[PDB]
Each structure stands twice: as structure tokens, then as C-alpha cells.
């Protein structure tokens, strides 16, 4: 309540959470702070008009925060923990949202400046900008049951949230992590298609969007199985079971696996390649 939050990073994910948080009415524009190593107009300048506090020193950020978010490229993290670790008091919890980066590698490198650092590994996606982001997290070792709560609550204010045994955090990144981009790509497609049919552009994009959204809900607000909802929507005639067949004919499912697998396998590498060199 007397809480403040900071993003040692910036860019999208920062802006994402920051935007979601303010809107969710949990924090306050000014009661947040993100550091601008350089300043990327889009991101940075955006936050400015938003109301957040931006400083070139991802240090004042650490002092200004009760809850610290590590939102920087995975390989950058090291060049931070050993630049801020010293400034890591005990009051604050450190939530690293960087991909692949292990809770361990952070603690056992950050502890070198503190007996027991409080850290949690996060995994979110851009949709947080609304309240439909899908977030997963894992509690550190020096993380009290009162921290997961604060976490599981600060995030549940902007999307979905659940404790997850870190070893899973890598798959999750493929699915819900990258997912929003597999979607943005699939929408653009559909529009283009709907358009190659007579529908105007704006109109097409919105129907495509709406179509997806709706599908989501039905699936979430029930079990059924994505399999069955497919059945409920296709009359023996055609019009749909037909479109399916086409998708089904070009390994449409196959290609989505291929992309989650890829997202994962990559995230593994990025980290399991930062373990040594
Ligand atoms: N702070 C928030 O504003 C949150 C909103 N929601 C939302 O979800 C919406 C649709 O409804 P929900 O019933 O509230 O979404 P959804 O929580 O049911 O999102 C999907 C989640 O289904 C969970 N899952 C949920 N019920 C399950 C059962 N059996 C097995 N796995 C299950 C899964 O963990 C999965 O992460 C959207 O309206 C969106 O508002 C969900 C969490 C937080
Ligand atoms: N935390 C709520 C958010 C919203 C709603 O459905 O109204 C949920 O996912 O159940």
C-alpha cells in the first residue's frame, strides 16, 4: 500500500506491466520507476507521457523500489546484479522477468552482497497491457510465503497468475510467452484472407480478432476440450469442416507445435549458454 515498484529495464515488457498496473488501479503512474539505458523513444518517451519516473541510473531505480523488476535482455542481467547487488536492501523483492535466466544464477551471484536476497522468477507477455496477460512465477529460496502472495496478487491484477515449478518456466515461455506473437501473426493472416474475399481491411482485422477472443472464452469458461468445441461449430455440410480440412492439409497444428518447441528450445539455449560463457 505504501508500495512502489521499479523496472531496472524498460522497453516493451516494462511499458506493458507499467501500463497494465496503472490501469488496473493498483499503483500510480508517478509511484513507479524505470531506468533508461539510452532511451528508445517508443518505450521511454511513452512512459513519460504516461507519468512514470524514468532515470538513466538503474540505481536510483533500485532505491526507489520496494518491488524490483528485472526487465532486461537475458545476458545483460549479470552486468546488473553485480552493479546493483550492493544497493539491494532487504525490504524489496526482486522479480526477474528476463527469459531463461534461472533464479539460482541470480541468487548465487547476488548473495555475494547480502545474506539472503528475496527473489522470484517471472514469466509474462505483452497483453498485460490490458488484463489478459498470462503470467507464471516461481518463488526463490529466500522467499517467504508472504512474498508469493504479494506477487500472485500484483500480477493477478493484470492477467492470469500461478506458482510454477521453475523447471516448467521454459515451456511456458514458448506457449503463453511467445504466443501473443503467434496470434498477432495469425490475425494479420486472417485479415489478409478475409480481405481476399471482399471484406474491407479494418472490418476484417476486427472480425478476425473478435473471432479468436470469443473462441478463447468458450474454452476457458468450460472444459469441453478444444477438440469438442471444434465439433460444436462444424455442421456436416461444410463451410467450416471444409476450412479445417485445408488447415489440416498443411500441418497447421504441426506448425504451431514447431513454434512452441522452437520458443522453448531457444530459451533453454539462451540460458544454458549463459551458464558458462
Ligand atoms: N486479474 C484478472 O483481471 C484476471 C482475469 N482472468 C480472465 O479471464 C477471462 C476469462 O475467464 P477465466 O474463468 O476468469 O480465464 P482463464 O484463468 O480460466 O485463463 C485461463 C487459465 O485457465 C486455468 N485453468 C482455469 N480453470 C481451469 C480448470 N481446470 C484446469 N485448468 C484451468 C488455467 O490455469 C489457465 O491458466 C478473461 O475474462 C480474463 O478476464 C483470469 C485471471 C486474472
Ligand atoms: N481474476 C479474474 C478476472 C476477471 C473476470 O472474469 O471478470 C478471473 O480470471 O476469474
Coordinates of C-alpha atoms and ligand atoms in Angstrom, one line a residue:
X1 CA 0.0 0.0 0.0
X2 CA 2.9 2.3 0.8
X3 CA 4.5 0.2 -2.0
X4 CA 6.5 1.4 -5.0
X5 CA 7.8 -0.5 -8.0
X6 CA 10.6 -0.2 -10.4
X7 CA 11.8 -1.8 -13.6
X8 CA 15.6 -2.0 -13.9
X9 CA 14.8 -2.3 -17.5
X10 CA 12.4 -0.6 -19.9
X11 CA 11.3 -1.4 -23.4
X12 CA 8.1 -3.3 -24.1
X13 CA 7.7 -5.6 -21.1
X14 CA 8.3 -2.7 -18.8
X15 CA 5.8 -0.5 -20.5
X16 CA 3.5 -3.5 -20.7
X17 CA 3.3 -4.1 -16.9
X18 CA 3.6 -0.4 -16.2
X19 CA 0.6 0.3 -18.4
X20 CA -1.4 -2.6 -17.0
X21 CA -0.5 -1.8 -13.4
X22 CA -1.6 1.8 -13.6
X23 CA -4.8 0.9 -15.4
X24 CA -5.6 -1.9 -13.0
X25 CA -5.6 0.9 -10.5
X26 CA -3.0 -0.9 -8.2
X27 CA -0.2 1.6 -8.2
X28 CA 0.2 5.1 -9.6
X29 CA 2.0 6.5 -12.7
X30 CA 4.5 8.5 -10.6
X31 CA 4.7 5.8 -7.9
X32 CA 6.7 3.7 -10.4
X33 CA 10.2 4.0 -11.9
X34 CA 12.1 2.5 -14.8
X35 CA 15.7 3.2 -15.9
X36 CA 16.5 4.3 -19.5
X37 CA 19.9 3.0 -20.5
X38 CA 20.0 5.2 -23.6
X39 CA 16.2 5.8 -24.2
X40 CA 14.2 4.2 -27.0
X41 CA 11.7 6.9 -28.0
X42 CA 8.8 4.5 -28.4
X43 CA 9.1 2.9 -25.0
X44 CA 10.8 5.6 -22.9
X45 CA 9.0 8.7 -24.3
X46 CA 5.8 6.7 -24.0
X47 CA 6.2 6.2 -20.2
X48 CA 7.0 9.9 -19.9
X49 CA 3.6 11.0 -21.2
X50 CA 2.2 8.1 -19.0
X51 CA 3.6 9.5 -15.8
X52 CA 6.2 7.0 -14.6
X53 CA 9.6 8.1 -13.3
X54 CA 12.5 7.3 -15.7
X55 CA 16.1 7.7 -14.7
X56 CA 19.3 6.9 -16.7
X57 CA 20.6 5.4 -13.5
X58 CA 19.2 1.9 -12.9
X59 CA 20.4 2.6 -9.4
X60 CA 18.0 5.3 -8.2
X61 CA 15.6 2.8 -9.6
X62 CA 16.7 0.3 -7.0
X63 CA 16.4 2.8 -4.2
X64 CA 13.0 4.0 -5.5
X65 CA 11.6 0.5 -5.5
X66 CA 10.0 -1.8 -2.9
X67 CA 9.4 -4.3 -5.7
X68 CA 12.1 -4.6 -8.3
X69 CA 11.5 -6.0 -11.8
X70 CA 14.5 -7.1 -13.9
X71 CA 13.3 -6.5 -17.4
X72 CA 16.4 -6.6 -19.5
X73 CA 17.9 -8.9 -22.1
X74 CA 19.0 -12.2 -20.5
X75 CA 22.7 -11.7 -21.0
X76 CA 22.5 -8.2 -19.5
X77 CA 21.2 -9.4 -16.1
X78 CA 24.8 -10.3 -14.9
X79 CA 26.1 -6.8 -15.7
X80 CA 23.4 -5.6 -13.4
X81 CA 23.2 -7.9 -10.4
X82 CA 26.9 -7.1 -9.8
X83 CA 26.2 -3.4 -10.2
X84 CA 23.1 -3.2 -8.1
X85 CA 23.5 -6.1 -5.8
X86 CA 25.4 -3.7 -3.4
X87 CA 22.3 -1.5 -3.4
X88 CA 19.9 -4.4 -2.7
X89 CA 18.4 -3.7 0.8
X90 CA 16.1 -6.3 2.4
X91 CA 12.8 -4.5 2.2
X92 CA 12.4 -5.2 -1.5
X93 CA 11.7 -8.4 -3.5
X94 CA 13.5 -8.9 -6.8
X95 CA 11.3 -10.3 -9.6
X96 CA 13.4 -11.2 -12.6
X97 CA 11.3 -11.4 -15.7
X98 CA 14.2 -12.0 -18.1
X99 CA 13.8 -15.2 -20.1
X100 CA 15.6 -18.4 -19.3
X101 CA 17.6 -16.7 -16.6
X102 CA 17.5 -19.0 -13.5
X103 CA 16.5 -18.0 -10.0
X104 CA 19.7 -19.7 -8.9
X105 CA 22.2 -18.0 -11.2
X106 CA 20.7 -14.7 -9.9
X107 CA 20.7 -15.5 -6.2
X108 CA 24.0 -17.3 -6.2
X109 CA 25.7 -14.2 -7.6
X110 CA 23.6 -11.6 -5.8
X111 CA 24.0 -13.2 -2.4
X112 CA 27.6 -12.0 -2.7
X113 CA 26.2 -8.7 -1.4
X114 CA 23.6 -9.9 1.0
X115 CA 22.9 -12.9 3.4
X116 CA 19.6 -13.8 1.9
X117 CA 18.1 -12.0 -1.1
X118 CA 14.4 -12.3 -1.8
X119 CA 13.8 -13.2 -5.4
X120 CA 11.1 -14.6 -7.7
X121 CA 11.3 -15.7 -11.3
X122 CA 8.6 -14.2 -13.5
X123 CA 7.2 -15.0 -17.0
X124 CA 4.6 -12.7 -18.5
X125 CA 3.6 -11.4 -22.0
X126 CA 2.6 -8.1 -23.6
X127 CA -1.3 -8.5 -23.2
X128 CA -0.6 -7.5 -19.6
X129 CA -1.2 -4.0 -21.2
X130 CA -4.9 -4.9 -20.7
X131 CA -5.6 -7.6 -18.2
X132 CA -5.3 -10.7 -20.3
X133 CA -1.6 -11.3 -19.9
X134 CA -0.7 -14.9 -18.9
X135 CA 1.7 -14.8 -16.0
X136 CA 3.7 -17.6 -14.3
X137 CA 6.2 -17.3 -11.5
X138 CA 8.4 -19.3 -9.2
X139 CA 9.5 -18.4 -5.6
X140 CA 13.1 -18.1 -4.8
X141 CA 14.8 -19.8 -1.9
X142 CA 14.9 -16.8 0.5
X143 CA 11.2 -16.1 -0.4
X144 CA 8.7 -16.0 2.4
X145 CA 5.1 -17.2 1.8
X146 CA 4.1 -13.5 2.2
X147 CA 6.1 -12.6 -1.0
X148 CA 4.5 -15.1 -3.3
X149 CA 1.2 -13.6 -2.2
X150 CA 2.2 -10.0 -2.9
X151 CA 3.4 -11.3 -6.3
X152 CA 0.5 -13.6 -7.1
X153 CA -1.7 -10.6 -6.3
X154 CA 0.2 -7.7 -8.0
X155 CA 0.2 -9.8 -11.2
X156 CA -3.3 -11.3 -10.9
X157 CA -4.3 -7.6 -11.1
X158 CA -3.2 -7.6 -14.8
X159 CA -3.8 -11.1 -16.0
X160 CA -3.6 -14.8 -15.1
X161 CA -1.1 -15.9 -12.4
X162 CA 0.2 -19.1 -10.9
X163 CA 3.1 -20.5 -8.9
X164 CA 5.0 -22.9 -11.2
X165 CA 8.0 -25.1 -10.5
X166 CA 10.7 -23.1 -12.3
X167 CA 11.8 -26.1 -14.5
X168 CA 8.5 -25.5 -16.4
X169 CA 9.0 -21.8 -16.8
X170 CA 10.9 -22.7 -20.1
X171 CA 7.9 -24.4 -21.8
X172 CA 5.5 -21.7 -20.5
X173 CA 7.6 -19.2 -22.3
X174 CA 7.1 -21.0 -25.6
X175 CA 3.3 -21.2 -25.2
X176 CA 1.9 -18.2 -23.3
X177 CA 5.2 -16.4 -23.5
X178 CA 5.7 -16.0 -27.3
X179 CA 2.1 -17.0 -28.0
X180 CA 0.7 -13.4 -28.3
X181 CA 3.0 -13.1 -31.3
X182 CA 1.8 -16.4 -32.9
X183 CA -1.6 -14.8 -32.6
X184 CA -0.7 -11.3 -34.0
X185 CA 0.7 -13.1 -36.9
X186 CA -2.4 -15.4 -37.3
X187 CA -4.7 -12.4 -37.2
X188 CA -2.8 -10.4 -39.8
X189 CA -3.1 -13.6 -42.0
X190 CA -6.9 -14.0 -41.5
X191 CA -7.4 -10.3 -42.2
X192 CA -5.5 -10.6 -45.5
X193 CA -7.6 -13.6 -46.2
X194 CA -10.9 -12.1 -45.3
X195 CA -9.8 -9.2 -47.5
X196 CA -9.0 -11.5 -50.4
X197 CA -12.7 -12.2 -50.2
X198 CA -14.3 -8.7 -50.4
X199 CA -14.2 -7.7 -46.8
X200 CA -12.5 -4.3 -46.2
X201 CA -9.3 -4.2 -44.2
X202 CA -10.4 -2.7 -40.9
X203 CA -13.6 -4.8 -40.9
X204 CA -11.6 -8.0 -41.5
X205 CA -9.0 -7.5 -38.8
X206 CA -11.6 -6.8 -36.1
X207 CA -13.8 -9.8 -37.0
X208 CA -10.7 -12.0 -37.0
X209 CA -9.7 -10.6 -33.7
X210 CA -13.2 -11.0 -32.3
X211 CA -13.4 -14.5 -33.6
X212 CA -10.3 -15.5 -31.7
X213 CA -11.3 -13.7 -28.5
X214 CA -14.6 -15.4 -28.4
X215 CA -13.1 -18.8 -29.0
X216 CA -10.7 -18.2 -26.1
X217 CA -13.5 -17.5 -23.6
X218 CA -15.6 -20.5 -24.6
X219 CA -12.5 -22.6 -24.0
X220 CA -11.6 -21.1 -20.7
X221 CA -15.2 -20.9 -19.2
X222 CA -15.6 -24.7 -19.6
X223 CA -13.6 -27.9 -20.2
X224 CA -15.1 -29.4 -23.3
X225 CA -11.7 -29.8 -24.9
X226 CA -10.6 -27.6 -27.9
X227 CA -11.4 -30.7 -29.8
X228 CA -15.1 -30.8 -29.0
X229 CA -15.7 -27.1 -29.4
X230 CA -14.4 -27.6 -32.9
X231 CA -17.2 -30.2 -33.4
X232 CA -19.9 -28.0 -31.9
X233 CA -19.1 -25.4 -34.6
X234 CA -19.0 -27.5 -37.7
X235 CA -22.2 -28.7 -39.5
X236 CA -21.8 -31.9 -41.5
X237 CA -22.3 -29.8 -44.6
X238 CA -19.2 -27.7 -44.8
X239 CA -18.3 -24.0 -44.7
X240 CA -16.1 -24.8 -41.6
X241 CA -15.3 -28.5 -41.6
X242 CA -14.1 -27.6 -45.0
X243 CA -11.7 -24.8 -43.9
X244 CA -10.5 -27.2 -41.3
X245 CA -9.5 -29.8 -43.9
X246 CA -7.4 -27.1 -45.6
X247 CA -5.6 -26.1 -42.4
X248 CA -5.4 -29.8 -41.6
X249 CA -3.9 -30.3 -45.0
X250 CA -0.9 -28.1 -44.4
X251 CA 0.2 -29.3 -41.0
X252 CA -1.4 -26.3 -39.3
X253 CA -1.2 -28.0 -35.9
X254 CA 2.2 -29.3 -36.7
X255 CA 3.5 -25.8 -37.4
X256 CA 2.2 -24.4 -34.0
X257 CA 4.0 -27.2 -32.1
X258 CA 7.1 -26.5 -34.2
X259 CA 6.9 -22.9 -32.9
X260 CA 6.3 -23.5 -29.2
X261 CA 9.1 -26.2 -29.3
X262 CA 11.3 -23.7 -31.0
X263 CA 10.5 -20.9 -28.5
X264 CA 11.3 -23.3 -25.6
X265 CA 14.5 -24.9 -27.1
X266 CA 15.7 -21.4 -27.7
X267 CA 15.0 -20.1 -24.2
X268 CA 16.8 -23.2 -22.9
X269 CA 19.9 -22.4 -25.1
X270 CA 20.0 -18.7 -24.3
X271 CA 20.3 -19.6 -20.6
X272 CA 22.1 -22.9 -20.8
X273 CA 24.6 -20.9 -22.8
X274 CA 24.9 -18.1 -20.2
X275 CA 25.7 -20.7 -17.5
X276 CA 29.3 -20.9 -18.7
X277 CA 30.5 -18.2 -21.2
Ligands
LIG1 N1 -6.9 -10.1 -12.9 C1 -7.6 -10.8 -13.9 O1 -8.3 -9.4 -14.4 C2 -7.7 -12.0 -14.4 C3 -8.6 -12.2 -15.3 N2 -8.8 -13.5 -15.8 C4 -9.6 -13.6 -17.2 O2 -10.1 -14.5 -17.9 C5 -11.0 -14.4 -18.6 C6 -11.9 -15.5 -19.0 O3 -12.1 -16.2 -17.7 P1 -11.3 -17.1 -16.6 O4 -12.6 -18.1 -15.9 O5 -11.6 -15.9 -15.2 O6 -9.9 -17.2 -17.5 P2 -8.7 -18.3 -17.6 O7 -8.0 -18.2 -15.9 O8 -9.8 -19.6 -16.9 O9 -7.4 -18.2 -18.2 C7 -7.0 -19.5 -18.4 C8 -6.4 -20.3 -17.3 O10 -7.4 -21.5 -17.2 C9 -6.7 -22.0 -15.8 N3 -7.4 -23.0 -15.7 C10 -8.5 -22.2 -15.2 N4 -9.6 -23.1 -14.9 C11 -9.1 -24.3 -15.0 C12 -9.8 -25.5 -14.7 N5 -9.2 -26.7 -15.0 C13 -8.0 -26.7 -15.5 N6 -7.2 -25.6 -15.8 C14 -7.9 -24.4 -15.5 C15 -5.6 -22.3 -16.4 O11 -4.6 -22.2 -15.4 C16 -5.3 -21.2 -17.4 O12 -4.1 -20.5 -16.9 C17 -11.0 -13.2 -19.1 O13 -12.2 -12.5 -18.9 C18 -10.0 -12.6 -18.2 O14 -10.6 -11.5 -17.5 C19 -8.0 -14.6 -15.2 C20 -7.1 -14.3 -14.2 C21 -6.9 -13.0 -13.8
LIG2 N1 -9.3 -12.8 -11.8 C1 -10.5 -12.9 -12.6 C2 -10.5 -11.8 -13.6 C3 -12.0 -11.5 -14.3 C4 -13.4 -11.8 -14.8 O1 -13.6 -12.8 -15.4 O2 -14.3 -10.9 -14.5 C5 -10.6 -14.3 -13.3 O3 -9.8 -14.6 -14.2 O4 -11.5 -15.0 -12.9

